[PDB]
Design a protein around this nucleic acid. Structure first.
Ligand SMILES: [Cl-]
Ligand SMILES: [Cl-]
Ligand SMILES: [Cl-]
Ligand SMILES: [Cl-]
Ligand SMILES: [Mn+2]
Ligand SMILES: [Mn+2]
Ligand SMILES: [Mn+2]
Ligand SMILES: [Mn+2]
Ligand SMILES: [Mn+2]
Ligand SMILES: [Mn+2]
Ligand SMILES: [Mn+2]
Ligand SMILES: [Mn+2]
Ligand SMILES: [Mn+2]
Lengths: 85, 99, 108, 96, 97, 78, 104, 94
DNA sequence: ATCAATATCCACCTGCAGATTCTACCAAAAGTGTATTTGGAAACTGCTCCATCAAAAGGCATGTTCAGCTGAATTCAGCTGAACATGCCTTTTGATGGAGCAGTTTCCAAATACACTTTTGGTAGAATCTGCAGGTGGATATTGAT
DNA sequence: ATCAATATCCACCTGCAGATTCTACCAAAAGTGTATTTGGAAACTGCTCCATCAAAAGGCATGTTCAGCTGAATTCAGCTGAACATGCCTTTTGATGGAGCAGTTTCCAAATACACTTTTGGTAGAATCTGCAGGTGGATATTGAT
């Protein structure tokens, strides 16, 4: 990534979180929801990326493929349609 | 006037607008960095197929939208219209994500 | 020898029976696969997809579009009590959600 | 020196034309369909595999597929699938 | 005439049953209901002793867990009394609805 | 029959669940819930019974049924 | 002269190996797979019995019963999560009352 | 006799190693039996899929390890991965 | 918060009933010694993609100002739900039988696996076809202030 | 009870990125001809399961009382939405390079395939002991009076 990647969870802006809550039908949002959502999202991604990477290392590859991600999502009971090629 | 909408009207306009569309609500690049950063801490020098990141973004957004749905039901159950951390906690607990 | 007749044409199906049979043999599901199994399964798959394309085609038509897209599939699936049950733990990429605003949120 | 990958795409397209002669499908939509066919396939074959196992049988037959279908699918969707499945078998065995 | 205050006995009951592990529903009533329900699917069926006990262990466990979630929903709404509304929210979120 | 699951019985289950106060509407709501539970499981249990060509529902049949429903049970053969 | 003793285990390498090939998991099963698998099972079992053994001790029982297993399991965070969707017949629940429910 | 087999002898042996003074009721043992069968299927099952995804026909200790890494939470995984590789080595040594 | 007067828990104890543990014997499995295959790993090598960076444009995130109206606090009592004493009967539980049926064996006709060979249906680019994304405008609601 | 003010639709158009077709091998079905495996079709067996039959002992269904929780009705300090001006940095396209999937070959360490021999693990009565049922006696609390 050339430049060190740091503190990117802050890339998930207040507005991007607001649009997500809207789609989920939320009308009013407390001020503390933003950090909480960042904390929950991080846990969600770590859990999935972890399993995905494990499939990658196991295939002795250096490239995380959509399949690795698809298989990891399924393990978490989070099945995804559209990326099996 | 200057014309000014009442608090909640535009919020409602936005709800209708996003429940009607399917585009990703989080920006691409920023989401991409987050994924590479998190992954970087598990195994260094990993590469990613463009599709891998897209799959991750589709899954995360669908997950959050759904969480907000449940979170909203919790807030409403407490006679509120405003979602708060306690709502996301109650929902994650009931879902069995943090029982 | 006799002219070739595909197992799909024999069962009167569009889904590949030979394909499915191979997939079953090589998926380590059992030591042996009966002749009727791939027919039955290949037919159920065809039935289920024909059943979702029906509903998605309509949704596409309700939106004055001639091409089915992920959103039409979501609408179809989530608006059908049973399909939704079946795909309750599945997510359709680029599917969005069903419009639904909790009444208490509407202006009073 | 080719790398050919199989898919359910042509079959899904033939079925789409049957139920909607005037409709087409975006490749991304086709991607959802292919994911769907593989998901159900595995869910069904999986249950069938266990069935034969619990019953000490080494062969998965149309009977195992059938009960798996009654186990995985909700109400009406199941009766329907059973109909199509049974119909296809009887027609196939009669070399019809 | 001695008379405990409302709640004190309910609490004493909570400690009692959370400490024990026996089935809380009467055997015959349950068994009879299982057979009845079973009839609406397959006919003239026989049941193994252990099969009915297995179903009962699962039910109680299931209802107990549901009541725990229901309780969290009631407490979330500033109440201490569970209401149908609480069971409904809980099942909504568990994906049972 | 569903009435066989009495009020004091539902109270007990709720107690182990930590519930201190109960609305009178709860008992019938709980019977409805319980019913759907038994149906979903017994449906599959019996289906396992019928595939094995048996007339007797075994503990395993139930165990497999609980497993499919994501309610894995321990102590009855599986 | 059994494989279990050759791996320093109590759990059945031979039987684990047989369950693996008969289980329709793959056309072939390597030599070390059963060893590794038997080991993980022995480790998980030891882990639970250890704690359940304690629970039985603190209850003054010489015999472990389901209550003890359910206690061992639910009070340990990782085991609880491993068995989050499992139910222990005759295990009951962890005593626990929500603070708002207590008087004074 | 045929009838059926369980893990009873083995579970009783591990118990004696950790609590020589302790025993186990019939039901608790029934529970351990279930437990063992359950974990077994989860790992063998995950190992099966792992092997299939990479187009491998044989299931080795490498697939069991990754399966354990995927199924066990944190520390439980670390200790299981150690006991496993540990057992392989000994088995392979003598 | 104390006293007093109940009311419930909670060890601890004894006498056994009945779970466990302990013994002794096999069928069923695992272990052995040889003998032969073969999945897949190591060694290249073609060439897809993926990592990164450059530029220009402009879609969006940010910080700021205000004040609408939502969450949080309170108060009050109507009436729901808990605690209890009663009286009844449904659930326990204890036999006794009869038999509906899981469980097993021995065969064999009917169904599957497999190596070899034909015969396409499928798939990967090219070569065509075209929806409908983006743009434009008036027509129609939908608000919010008067 | 309106009307500027804005946002939301609806219908029309066009050409180019994204489907659909058209081509042509060719991987992989399907057709043959054997070589195994099976699923049961009968015929028998001990069982676990229903069926009744019959005391009765908790447990539950009821009817009273009334403590105190759930909601309704208010109040109002601030948080959070609505609008704006800024100007940062995400999007879009493409260019470079070369990291690393994927495709092929070659060939052993490792896995399968028998033929037998050893060793287990499952069973079921016998021989232990360990909880359990009841009974206290003494903590621990509750609840009402002051
Ligand atoms: Cl909060
Ligand atoms: Cl068949
Ligand atoms: Cl309610
Ligand atoms: Cl191995
Ligand atoms: Mn049609
Ligand atoms: Mn080879
Ligand atoms: Mn309010
Ligand atoms: Mn009052
Ligand atoms: Mn052709
Ligand atoms: Mn448009
Ligand atoms: Mn040989
Ligand atoms: Mn022995
Ligand atoms: Mn006692």
């Amino acid at each position: 990534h050339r430049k060190v990647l740091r503190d990117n969870i802050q890339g998930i802006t207040k507005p991007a979180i607001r649009r997500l809550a809207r789609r989920g039908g939320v009308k009013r949002i407390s001020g503390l929801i933003y950090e909480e959502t960042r904390g929950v999202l991080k846990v969600f991604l770590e859990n999935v990326i972890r399993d995905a990477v494990t499939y990658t290392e196991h295939a002795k590859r250096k490239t995380v493929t959509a399949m690795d991600v698809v298989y990891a999502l399924k393990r978490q009971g989070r099945t995804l349609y559209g990326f099996g090629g | 006037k200057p014309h000014r909408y009442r608090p909640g009207t535009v919020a409602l306009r936005e709800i209708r607008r996003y429940q009607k569309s399917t585009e990703l609500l989080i920006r691409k690049l920023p989401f991409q960095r987050l994924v590479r950063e998190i992954a970087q801490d598990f195994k260094t020098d990993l590469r990613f197929q463009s599709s891998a990141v897209m799959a991750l973004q589709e899954a995360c957004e669908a997950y959050l939208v759904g969480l907000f749905e449940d979170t909203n039901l919790c807030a409403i159950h407490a006679k509120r219209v405003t979602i708060m951390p306690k709502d996301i906690q109650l929902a994650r607990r009931i879902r069995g994500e943090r029982a | 020898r006799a002219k070739a007749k595909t197992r799909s044409s024999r069962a009167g199906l569009q889904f590949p029976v030979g394909r499915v049979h191979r997939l079953l043999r090589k998926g380590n599901y059992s030591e042996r696969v009966g002749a009727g199994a791939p027919v039955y399964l290949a037919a159920v798959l065809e039935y289920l997809t024909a059943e979702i394309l029906e509903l998605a085609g309509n949704a596409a038509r309700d939106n004055k579009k001639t091409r089915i897209i992920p959103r039409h599939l979501q609408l179809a699936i989530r608006n059908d009590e049973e399909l939704n049950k079946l795909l309750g733990r599945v997510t359709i990429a680029q599917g969005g959600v069903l419009p639904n605003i909790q009444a208490v949120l509407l202006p009073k | 020196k080719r790398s050919r990958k199989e898919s359910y795409s042509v079959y899904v397209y033939k079925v789409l034309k049957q139920v909607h002669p005037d409709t087409g499908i975006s490749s991304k939509a086709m991607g959802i369909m292919n994911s769907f066919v593989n998901d159900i396939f595995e869910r069904i074959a999986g249950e069938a595999s266990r069935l034969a196992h619990y019953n000490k049988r080494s062969t998965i037959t149309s009977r195992e597929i059938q009960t798996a279908v009654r186990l995985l699918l909700p109400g009406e969707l199941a009766k329907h699938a059973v109909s199509e499945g049974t119909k296809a078998v009887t027609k196939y065995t009669s070399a019809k």
